[PDB]
Each structure stands twice: as C-alpha cells, then as structure tokens.
Backbone as ProteinMPNN parsed JSONL, in Angstrom:
{"seq_chain_A": "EPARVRCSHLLVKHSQSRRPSSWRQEQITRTQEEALELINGYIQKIKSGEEDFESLASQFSDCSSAKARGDLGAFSRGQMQKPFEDASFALRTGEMSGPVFTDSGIHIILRTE", "coords_chain_A": {"N_chain_A": [[-2.711, -25.741, 13.9], [-2.618, -22.491, 12.301], [-0.153, -20.877, 10.015], [0.381, -18.273, 10.664], [-1.179, -15.63, 12.583], [-3.616, -13.07, 12.471], [-3.969, -10.198, 14.397], [-5.544, -7.785, 16.557], [-5.048, -5.338, 19.024], [-5.243, -3.835, 22.358], [-3.299, -1.971, 24.254], [-2.411, -1.229, 27.566], [-0.094, 0.573, 29.048], [2.224, 0.91, 31.903], [3.96, 2.574, 34.703], [6.093, 0.81, 35.273], [6.616, -0.321, 32.812], [8.38, -1.611, 29.935], [9.021, 0.458, 28.162], [8.142, 3.324, 29.249], [6.346, 5.309, 28.021], [4.223, 6.782, 25.498], [2.527, 7.227, 22.241], [0.277, 8.833, 22.831], [0.698, 9.705, 25.568], [3.259, 11.49, 27.111], [4.927, 10.763, 29.399], [4.467, 7.771, 30.957], [2.6, 7.532, 33.825], [0.893, 5.962, 35.356], [0.127, 3.283, 37.69], [0.828, -0.319, 37.861], [-1.321, -1.698, 38.987], [-3.464, 0.313, 38.551], [-3.421, 0.255, 35.654], [-4.285, -2.492, 35.047], [-6.792, -2.334, 36.323], [-8.019, -0.43, 34.532], [-7.916, -2.012, 32.069], [-9.569, -4.238, 32.719], [-11.942, -2.811, 33.129], [-12.423, -1.883, 30.498], [-12.739, -4.445, 29.205], [-15.07, -5.353, 30.464], [-16.994, -3.335, 29.58], [-16.825, -3.792, 26.816], [-17.692, -6.469, 26.647], [-20.422, -6.103, 27.512], [-21.489, -4.336, 25.598], [-21.447, -1.607, 25.732], [-19.062, -0.427, 24.851], [-16.964, -0.303, 21.863], [-14.357, -2.504, 20.985], [-12.246, -1.983, 18.901], [-12.68, 0.844, 18.659], [-12.189, 1.794, 21.287], [-9.521, 0.927, 21.33], [-8.19, 2.625, 19.423], [-8.482, 5.076, 20.763], [-7.469, 4.888, 23.508], [-5.335, 2.915, 23.588], [-1.869, 2.314, 24.362], [-0.029, 1.552, 22.427], [1.511, 2.19, 19.251], [-0.116, 1.113, 17.256], [-2.667, 1.943, 17.613], [-3.49, 4.025, 15.925], [-4.172, 2.493, 13.691], [-6.574, 1.331, 14.511], [-5.882, -0.482, 16.587], [-4.775, -2.691, 15.183], [-2.218, -5.052, 14.535], [-1.435, -6.55, 12.39], [-0.407, -9.522, 10.56], [1.233, -12.252, 12.219], [3.856, -14.66, 12.88], [4.849, -17.535, 14.972], [7.593, -16.951, 17.32], [8.039, -14.213, 17.103], [6.541, -12.083, 18.482], [6.279, -11.188, 22.062], [6.506, -14.087, 24.076], [4.123, -14.55, 26.135], [2.037, -12.91, 24.883], [2.127, -13.929, 22.211], [1.442, -16.758, 22.745], [-1.261, -16.523, 23.888], [-2.598, -15.151, 21.707], [-2.368, -17.131, 19.437], [-3.944, -19.162, 20.636], [-6.511, -18.131, 20.695], [-9.756, -18.084, 19.034], [-10.844, -17.221, 15.695], [-12.227, -13.988, 15.776], [-12.528, -14.031, 18.517], [-11.919, -12.66, 21.795], [-9.287, -11.978, 24.111], [-8.527, -12.202, 27.739], [-7.102, -10.217, 30.331], [-3.673, -9.883, 29.395], [-0.291, -10.34, 30.164], [2.861, -8.744, 29.438], [6.325, -7.56, 29.004], [5.963, -5.063, 27.815], [3.616, -4.046, 28.776], [0.097, -4.206, 29.837], [-2.216, -6.186, 28.008], [-5.161, -6.547, 25.844], [-6.389, -8.679, 23.643], [-7.571, -9.279, 20.289], [-8.423, -11.747, 18.072], [-8.401, -11.635, 14.578], [-7.882, -12.787, 12.037]], "CA_chain_A": [[-2.362, -24.302, 13.951], [-2.234, -21.793, 11.058], [1.256, -20.414, 10.063], [0.326, -16.928, 11.283], [-2.502, -15.162, 12.987], [-3.66, -11.603, 12.491], [-4.635, -9.716, 15.61], [-5.666, -6.404, 16.993], [-4.942, -5.252, 20.495], [-5.329, -2.621, 23.16], [-2.218, -2.016, 25.257], [-2.396, -0.174, 28.613], [1.243, 0.554, 29.673], [2.303, 1.376, 33.309], [5.302, 3.114, 35.031], [7.153, -0.249, 35.214], [6.692, -0.922, 31.458], [9.684, -1.605, 29.256], [9.154, 1.832, 27.596], [7.051, 4.032, 29.946], [5.927, 6.494, 27.21], [3.454, 6.351, 24.308], [2.131, 8.314, 21.321], [-0.743, 9.602, 23.565], [1.128, 10.254, 26.88], [4.732, 11.658, 27.187], [5.483, 9.935, 30.472], [3.401, 6.977, 31.578], [2.714, 7.629, 35.294], [-0.025, 5.039, 36.05], [0.65, 2.075, 38.316], [0.411, -1.632, 37.304], [-2.697, -1.895, 39.504], [-4.396, 1.15, 37.756], [-3.461, -0.267, 34.269], [-5.168, -3.692, 35.057], [-8.146, -1.815, 36.619], [-8.547, 0.095, 33.225], [-8.04, -3.164, 31.165], [-10.785, -4.955, 33.133], [-13.073, -1.872, 32.876], [-12.597, -2.001, 29.024], [-13.269, -5.797, 28.919], [-16.48, -5.398, 30.881], [-17.821, -2.478, 28.702], [-16.822, -4.48, 25.494], [-18.588, -7.623, 26.787], [-21.826, -5.611, 27.637], [-21.885, -3.585, 24.399], [-21.223, -0.181, 25.96], [-17.952, 0.042, 24.01], [-16.433, -1.082, 20.756], [-12.898, -2.777, 21.15], [-11.402, -1.177, 17.966], [-12.839, 2.284, 18.986], [-11.378, 1.977, 22.524], [-8.118, 0.753, 20.96], [-7.693, 3.882, 18.781], [-8.573, 6.158, 21.773], [-6.661, 4.62, 24.73], [-4.175, 1.978, 23.548], [-0.511, 2.927, 24.345], [0.789, 1.042, 21.333], [1.249, 3.019, 18.037], [-1.129, 0.44, 16.409], [-3.915, 2.655, 17.917], [-3.886, 4.748, 14.691], [-4.804, 1.48, 12.812], [-7.637, 0.777, 15.375], [-5.312, -1.623, 17.324], [-4.201, -3.744, 14.351], [-0.778, -5.388, 14.475], [-1.193, -7.295, 11.15], [-0.156, -10.93, 10.784], [2.538, -12.646, 12.788], [4.123, -16.092, 13.153], [5.441, -17.693, 16.305], [8.987, -16.45, 17.27], [8.095, -12.785, 16.778], [6.034, -11.302, 19.606], [6.745, -11.759, 23.351], [5.788, -15.338, 24.338], [2.739, -14.446, 26.664], [1.172, -12.343, 23.819], [2.113, -14.982, 21.176], [0.607, -17.903, 23.147], [-2.685, -16.102, 23.997], [-3.051, -14.924, 20.326], [-2.604, -18.387, 18.679], [-4.983, -19.916, 21.359], [-7.819, -17.496, 20.346], [-10.502, -18.438, 17.805], [-11.024, -15.97, 14.941], [-13.371, -13.231, 16.363], [-12.464, -14.153, 19.996], [-11.129, -11.695, 22.541], [-8.59, -12.514, 25.306], [-8.75, -11.466, 28.979], [-5.797, -9.589, 30.524], [-2.447, -10.6, 28.988], [0.874, -9.506, 30.548], [4.175, -8.776, 28.734], [7.124, -6.441, 29.522], [5.476, -3.767, 27.254], [2.481, -3.601, 29.623], [-1.048, -5.167, 29.869], [-2.974, -6.224, 26.74], [-6.452, -7.182, 25.546], [-6.181, -9.084, 22.244], [-8.729, -9.704, 19.471], [-7.92, -12.38, 16.836], [-9.257, -11.306, 13.418], [-7.624, -13.799, 10.983]], "C_chain_A": [[-1.982, -23.621, 12.639], [-0.757, -21.341, 11.1], [1.385, -19.092, 10.803], [-1.074, -16.563, 11.665], [-2.51, -13.648, 12.896], [-4.428, -11.211, 13.736], [-4.566, -8.226, 15.803], [-5.54, -6.42, 18.494], [-5.044, -3.843, 21.053], [-4.303, -2.825, 24.26], [-2.302, -0.908, 26.29], [-1.031, -0.337, 29.326], [1.152, 1.032, 31.131], [3.715, 1.871, 33.612], [6.407, 2.087, 35.05], [7.261, -0.902, 33.835], [8.06, -0.768, 30.891], [10.04, -0.239, 28.675], [7.962, 2.62, 28.136], [6.678, 5.375, 29.313], [5.159, 5.992, 26.001], [3.11, 7.511, 23.389], [1.184, 9.345, 21.982], [-0.345, 10.216, 24.907], [2.667, 10.302, 26.999], [5.425, 10.78, 28.205], [4.368, 9.098, 31.059], [3.597, 7.042, 33.107], [1.813, 6.636, 36.053], [0.634, 3.773, 36.58], [0.142, 0.811, 37.655], [-1.015, -1.954, 37.716], [-3.692, -1.006, 38.699], [-4.528, 0.652, 36.296], [-4.404, -1.493, 34.15], [-6.607, -3.281, 35.392], [-8.747, -1.252, 35.305], [-8.827, -1.032, 32.209], [-9.335, -3.923, 31.452], [-12.027, -4.124, 32.899], [-13.416, -1.952, 31.39], [-13.212, -3.339, 28.639], [-14.727, -5.854, 29.285], [-17.422, -4.514, 30.029], [-17.899, -3.118, 27.277], [-17.748, -5.72, 25.569], [-20.085, -7.221, 26.856], [-22.38, -4.902, 26.403], [-21.663, -2.083, 24.536], [-20.091, 0.368, 25.104], [-17.494, -0.9, 22.907], [-14.908, -1.273, 20.953], [-12.012, -1.977, 20.222], [-11.514, 0.35, 18.205], [-12.005, 2.583, 20.24], [-9.872, 1.874, 22.185], [-7.522, 2.014, 20.372], [-7.626, 5.079, 19.738], [-7.596, 6.095, 22.96], [-5.511, 3.656, 24.665], [-2.805, 2.655, 23.488], [0.451, 2.425, 23.267], [0.531, 1.905, 20.102], [0.231, 2.401, 17.088], [-2.505, 1.092, 16.61], [-4.398, 3.397, 16.672], [-4.559, 3.772, 13.72], [-5.881, 0.679, 13.569], [-7.165, -0.469, 16.178], [-4.643, -2.727, 16.502], [-2.699, -3.841, 14.276], [-0.45, -6.155, 13.181], [-0.963, -8.772, 11.478], [1.186, -11.219, 11.387], [2.658, -14.132, 13.073], [4.614, -16.311, 14.554], [6.88, -17.16, 16.218], [9.113, -14.968, 16.962], [7.72, -11.869, 17.898], [6.536, -11.87, 20.942], [5.896, -12.99, 23.628], [4.401, -15.273, 25.023], [1.697, -13.948, 25.637], [1.005, -13.407, 22.709], [1.238, -16.175, 21.574], [-0.868, -17.607, 23.204], [-3.254, -15.914, 22.576], [-3.315, -16.195, 19.534], [-3.727, -19.264, 19.313], [-6.388, -19.409, 21.048], [-8.447, -17.97, 19.048], [-10.642, -17.139, 17.002], [-12.281, -15.283, 15.49], [-13.425, -13.266, 17.914], [-11.501, -13.147, 20.651], [-10.514, -12.334, 23.814], [-8.948, -11.721, 26.554], [-7.474, -10.628, 29.135], [-4.624, -10.451, 30.109], [-1.204, -9.792, 29.386], [2.169, -9.808, 29.829], [5.038, -7.643, 29.275], [6.673, -5.083, 28.971], [4.361, -3.176, 28.094], [1.348, -4.639, 29.658], [-1.874, -5.06, 28.593], [-4.315, -6.949, 26.779], [-6.265, -7.426, 24.031], [-7.443, -9.58, 21.563], [-8.225, -10.436, 18.242], [-8.888, -12.103, 15.707], [-9.096, -12.287, 12.271], [-6.826, -14.99, 11.535]], "O_chain_A": [[-1.109, -24.118, 11.927], [-0.154, -21.423, 12.17], [2.38, -18.837, 11.48], [-2.043, -17.114, 11.142], [-1.509, -13.006, 13.213], [-5.431, -11.837, 14.078], [-3.685, -7.525, 15.304], [-5.886, -7.401, 19.151], [-4.95, -2.838, 20.347], [-4.422, -3.731, 25.085], [-2.266, 0.265, 25.918], [-0.844, -1.269, 30.108], [0.099, 1.514, 31.548], [4.615, 1.599, 32.818], [7.569, 2.446, 34.862], [7.924, -1.929, 33.694], [8.824, 0.103, 31.308], [11.2, 0.172, 28.69], [6.884, 2.589, 27.543], [6.69, 6.42, 29.965], [5.416, 4.887, 25.523], [3.376, 8.665, 23.727], [1.276, 10.547, 21.73], [-0.991, 11.166, 25.35], [3.31, 9.252, 26.989], [6.416, 10.123, 27.887], [3.412, 9.647, 31.608], [4.647, 6.649, 33.614], [1.956, 6.484, 37.266], [1.583, 3.259, 35.989], [-0.871, 0.848, 36.956], [-1.819, -2.421, 36.908], [-4.686, -1.538, 38.205], [-5.635, 0.632, 35.759], [-5.237, -1.53, 33.244], [-7.547, -3.821, 34.81], [-9.893, -1.573, 34.994], [-9.869, -1.012, 31.553], [-10.105, -4.216, 30.537], [-13.064, -4.661, 32.511], [-14.591, -2.078, 31.046], [-14.128, -3.37, 27.817], [-15.545, -6.348, 28.508], [-18.557, -4.921, 29.782], [-18.928, -2.997, 26.612], [-18.506, -5.975, 24.633], [-20.928, -7.934, 26.31], [-23.592, -4.871, 26.188], [-21.692, -1.364, 23.537], [-20.154, 1.519, 24.673], [-17.62, -2.12, 23.008], [-14.209, -0.268, 21.081], [-11.083, -1.328, 20.703], [-10.544, 1.072, 17.977], [-11.208, 3.521, 20.246], [-9.062, 2.646, 22.697], [-6.442, 2.433, 20.789], [-6.814, 5.985, 19.55], [-6.993, 7.094, 23.352], [-4.749, 3.577, 25.629], [-2.598, 3.507, 22.624], [1.609, 2.839, 23.217], [-0.609, 2.332, 19.918], [-0.253, 3.09, 16.191], [-3.424, 0.814, 15.84], [-5.596, 3.4, 16.389], [-5.45, 4.189, 12.98], [-6.076, -0.506, 13.301], [-7.948, -1.388, 16.416], [-4.006, -3.612, 17.072], [-2.0, -2.868, 13.996], [0.727, -6.387, 12.906], [-1.298, -9.217, 12.576], [2.166, -10.528, 11.113], [1.688, -14.784, 13.459], [4.786, -15.337, 15.287], [7.354, -16.934, 15.105], [10.195, -14.509, 16.594], [8.481, -10.966, 18.246], [7.158, -12.932, 20.954], [4.681, -12.949, 23.436], [3.504, -15.934, 24.501], [0.604, -14.508, 25.541], [-0.116, -13.739, 22.324], [0.364, -16.566, 20.8], [-1.666, -18.349, 22.632], [-4.307, -16.475, 22.275], [-4.411, -16.337, 18.991], [-4.384, -20.022, 18.599], [-7.352, -20.171, 21.128], [-7.743, -18.228, 18.072], [-10.563, -16.056, 17.583], [-13.308, -15.943, 15.651], [-14.266, -12.609, 18.527], [-10.432, -12.841, 20.124], [-11.164, -13.13, 24.493], [-9.599, -10.681, 26.458], [-6.818, -10.352, 28.131], [-4.584, -11.636, 30.438], [-1.083, -8.64, 28.968], [2.535, -10.967, 29.632], [4.494, -6.794, 29.982], [6.96, -4.052, 29.58], [4.174, -1.96, 28.127], [1.613, -5.833, 29.523], [-2.193, -3.956, 28.15], [-4.563, -7.822, 27.611], [-6.018, -6.498, 23.262], [-8.283, -10.226, 22.188], [-7.621, -9.782, 17.393], [-10.09, -12.318, 15.865], [-10.075, -12.597, 11.591], [-6.522, -15.926, 10.796]]}, "name": "protein", "num_of_chains": 1, "seq": "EPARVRCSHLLVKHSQSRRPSSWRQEQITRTQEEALELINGYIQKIKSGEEDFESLASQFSDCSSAKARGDLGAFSRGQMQKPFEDASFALRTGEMSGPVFTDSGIHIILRTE"}
C-alpha cells in the first residue's frame, strides 16, 4: 500500500446526511433512496460513455470539491471516514468505485494517483 492515495469523487447528499446542505442546494430535501437512485444512474452513464465522471462531479456533486471537478487531493489513512478511506485505498489507479456510504452521504470515487 502507498502512503497516500489521491482521489476524486462525486457526493450525492440526502436529508439524513450529517450536513443536509451544499454549495449547489440550500437545503438538501432528497431521500436516501433518491440519492442512491441518482448515484447508480451516474455510474451506469459513466460506464456506457454517456457521461464523464469529472464533468458530472462539477455539475452535481454536493461536496465543495465539485469546483475542482471532484478532486479531494491526496490523503493518508486516519483522515477520511473509514468506509470512504477503505474503498479508496482498495481502488487501482484509474479505477472507479460503486456506491460508497458515509455519514456525509453517498459517494462514487475515482482513484487518480
């Protein structure tokens, strides 16, 4: 395992998220079920070619990293929430994760470095 991994992500928050508000939406009103339905819709359009992950990230991700096309930069273990951290280190460089759940909401992760 490397010391750190760099990753990009797309976060779809929901009304039960730790902070139910984002740069793009004042009050998150969508349900956990609708958030996972959107996440899976994004995964399927990214797998087919219909959409670009970093483009979707800048447009719809509820994390402020959206302005940097989803990029979170590099991080070591002991920093991010354990579900996100484990999925990220498990990914090969250039590999994308499926749905990943954390208290912030639901994520799709892309390891870049």
